[PDB]
Amino acid sequence: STSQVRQNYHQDSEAAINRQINLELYASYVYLSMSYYFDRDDVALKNFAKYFLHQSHEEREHAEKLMKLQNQRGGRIFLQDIQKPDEDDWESGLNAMEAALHLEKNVNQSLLELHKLAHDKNDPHLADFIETHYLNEQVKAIKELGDHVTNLRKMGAPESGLAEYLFDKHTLGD
């Protein structure tokens, strides 16, 4: 069918959207994994644990937002498997942060491509949606992972464990 509400809504755009949803749920899955990793009795950095748990809940917010744009435009949601992440053990506070930064650069890439598509297919509505709710969020996050990584490294992580423990106290703990 074609929904009564659909208008200037191209099907690459619609299919690009069902792709992002999955990517956002993917990242939500990664951050859950990082979170409970730093909750391990042998790692025990509670603020690393809550930092990523919060990112896990936000990625969820991202996907649900897109699931809403879809129906709003008259596209139809098709869901897919969520890949388990690439690790079971994230090694270190620094390394987990670097993986986070890598993950978000990559989600950012897809958002930019999704913007290009929306622009190329002359969807001003879809494109302002990406710029308003996603683009600058991803710059902020990526700037923030960058800063953390810079600070964990300058402090002598992940060699110095003292380093990671003070960072969990003094940066991720308000």
Can you say which residues are annotated as belonging to the binding site? Answer: 24, 59, 62, 104, 138
> Is residue 91 within the footprint of a copy of itself (CB under 8 A)?
no
| Residue 59 touching Zn ion (CB under 5 A) | yes
Single out the residue of 100, 170, 31 nearest to residue 39, CA to CA: 31
CA pair distance 18, 29, nearest whole angstrom: 17
119-149 b/e (C-beta count within 10 Å ≥ 16 → b): eebebeebbebbeeebeeebeebbeebeebb
Cα-Cα end-to-end distance for the chain: 51
Q: Give the one residue of 86, 89, 113, 131 binding Na ion; rule: CB under 5 A.
A: 131
Q: By rule CB under 5 A, what count of residues binds Na ion?
A: 2
Q: Which C-beta is closer to a copy of itself: that of 12 or that of 84?
A: 84
Residue from the set 30, 52, 62, 155 that interacts with Zn ion by CB under 5 A: 62
Tell me the window of 53-61, 83-91, 121-129, 143-151 that interacts with Zn ion (CB under 5 A). Answer: 53-61
* Binding annotation for Fe cation: 24, 59, 62, 104, 138
